[model samples]
Target chain A: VLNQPSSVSGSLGQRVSITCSGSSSNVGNGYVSWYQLIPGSAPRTLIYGDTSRASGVPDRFSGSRSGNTATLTISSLQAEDEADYFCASAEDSSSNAVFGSGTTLTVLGQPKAAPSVTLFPPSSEELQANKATLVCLISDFYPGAVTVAWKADSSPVKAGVETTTPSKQSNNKYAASSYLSLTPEQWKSHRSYSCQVTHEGSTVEKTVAPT
Target chain B: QVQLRESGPSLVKPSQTLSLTCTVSGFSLSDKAVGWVRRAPGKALEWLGSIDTGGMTGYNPGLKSRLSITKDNSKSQVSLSVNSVTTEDSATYYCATVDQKTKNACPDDFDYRCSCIGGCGCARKGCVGPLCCRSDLGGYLTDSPAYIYEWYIDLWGQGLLVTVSSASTKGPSVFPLAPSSKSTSGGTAALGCLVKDYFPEPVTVSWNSGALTSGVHTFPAVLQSSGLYSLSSVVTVPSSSLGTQTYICNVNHKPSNTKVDKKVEPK
Candidate 1:
């Protein structure tokens, strides 16, 4: 069956290659194309017709054919080169096109690390209005997977909470923020409110006491 | 009100042909262009090829040899056939309307404008203009501005998430590394909180003051070559209560559910 590596990883400046296999019914008789997708964005053609580079595609990316299989190679990979890749082929006589399952290319640069967490209490005006808002910020971690939880006086909190989707930074990292709302009475009486962030296998927590 | 849907085999064996169909509704295949797009799991999108209403077809040159895009006006459908499939050819294929507006802009004033926008290097590479550049480069430059503009507008306006693979596995370190207070010329006390050495990104910082304060600002996080981050925030408080009051700087690192609190007091 047509198959691709589920995922491939390499360090920067290293050579990475993936292949698509097909029989004479398709590969040997028709053209092949490669695409690069950056997730959520439209796919860009990397190489088409087996060995031709798409316009603006860097020289580092190359495509070749051997018998019925097509191969895509990336030499001296860059950070932005980490993306999903796919290969498509045209059949010899049919007006049909087929695509193989995509493969993820991960260019290893930074190791996964824990995020920093901070908990901010409400303002004086918020207290006077009988409503308090607490903020939890999560930032500066790799891989972008993390969990956040809120606690009041060591007890889990479930109500009046909102969490934002993680945002990507210019450095290709991620950050996320969560909000916790409370009443003035809850704020003044519960001095030990906390925001906890978990990443990889470790957990970090920050607690704030209301004045 | 055009609708396009793609159907194809979910699995294919190596050394076989792959065939897919794009069935359209609410529009005539005779009057519109249809194209194929695909994506890998958690990856970006790729355009395969397209067939216009007039039966004119275009294929990504890299795949032109093995790719064929055809249309059946009687069935209001378009077909794609590719030969010699492999695992790398696997993806979720889609059928979409080729933006005619952008296609019509090619090899003309728009190309000239885009060539300049691409910088002098593009011109130096034998690009007399967008129309005069090689077919691959010219066509790409001609189609890019419109698509890129639309992509950005969609992102900013819709808050859509571009799917991406995870970059790191570990969380960052959390701590209140520094806090300082100073007197400003406006008779206000300036308080600063410094957070350092975080990884991945997007840490939150905020201040809570018992006294009234104004003019708060938080600097953008700075990324280091080591893949860590650092940032600082400042706020202004009345000078009268500077030494007698305390302000709390709270930081939240969501990925790890970690937080840090630093209290700033006037010295």
Candidate 2:
């Protein structure tokens, strides 16, 4: 049997540690490995063979083993360090890898302010090509999770649009872009097009008129 | 009409072995194929191994070293045995059928061909392995022999919830990836929403176009290597509504109490 904490919370820049315990037949006589899983990404090996960090893993992450247990420590935690962590032990006799229940780490920090939203109408050249592309630019949002929506004449538009995945900015904030595609004929006829951004329980709306 | 049921131990001691039996009915064991799939708690799915009516067998490389898949023709049952099991091996094990059509199309020496026990004249096709078939056009087409019909899972037994003494609770995260729109051959538009990084299964995704009540098509959630699930949903819109209408992608994840509404509007 293996044991892991269900959840751990800490403030940014603080240190956090989680432990995994196994029976003598498991961790006591064998090696332990740790993995970190970020939401929307693959699980990454952080530490292997009880004490060695995997290639490319930062020195901030460390692992150690004691009697019938192993521990993983993260120092100087950043916002991105919030993730799910799992530990596995290889049994010496059976060569079986036993995984512990996962632990979730949440870093508490001041939430980033909402993004600035803007709408850019199709260019004259784009309209000449019979293509009208409206752009919604969202920038300076922290925490990197936001939703974008578009509307035409005050009605929610569900199709014919594309939104980019949130991109991390140098300041540790996020920026994203969304596009609304239309025919030149429609652009000339539609009166109002709007872009709505929802972030951190607040919504920002911007409207533009096509010439 | 065929059905499958899986039975295995609920708790396994470390360094011990695990044995599971898949009892099938309404089909001849000698004529149908069966396989095993499993999912750890709050994690992605994993295909363990499979065996066909012809005695042909295949195993996932990650588990092949300690896994054994066998069948009892007389009893109409398939069996799986894993040695030296641990907490990582604790999961809900399921039994599913191998796609018979693909199995029949496979040539001998293919990785997934049915049993070669008896002296069957098995010859290699132009394709090197069962994973790919040689197309008549001189190109190889990829194919998987294991196909699980969504509703067919109803024929499965109550999944065995394997657990250990130490455990904890978990949840999921739901986010929308980029949405795309394309012009179809019929001049209509196809809109797609990619929902990524959710867990604990059974996420419902719906689409709406203003008050139009558009019909949405949702695909199965695929397991990413990170042990999370991602799914894609699409809907078709008429050309007439392209510029004046807006669409909404609503994702409801019950396990996580997450509800996300993302909208797109053509200019």
Top model by TM-score, which number?
1
* lDDT tens per residue, model 2, B1-267: 666777765555677778889888888878866767666867744557667678877676678999999999899889998888777887777676553222222234433333323222222444443333334323333222222111111123434455432322123332222222322335665554555556545566777633434444454555555555555555667766765777777877654456777765553
DockQ (model 1, Cα): 0.03
Positional deviation of residue A67's Cα in model 1 after best superposition, in angstroms: 2.2
What are the clashing pairs of model 2? Answer: A156-B246, A157-B246, A157-B247, A157-B264, A158-B246, A158-B247, B54-B115, B56-B115
Q: What CAPRI grade goes to candidate 1?
A: incorrect
Docking class of 2: incorrect
Local accuracy by lDDT, each model: 0.61, 0.63
- TM match of model 1 to true structure: 0.46
Which candidate has the top score in lDDT?
Answer: 2
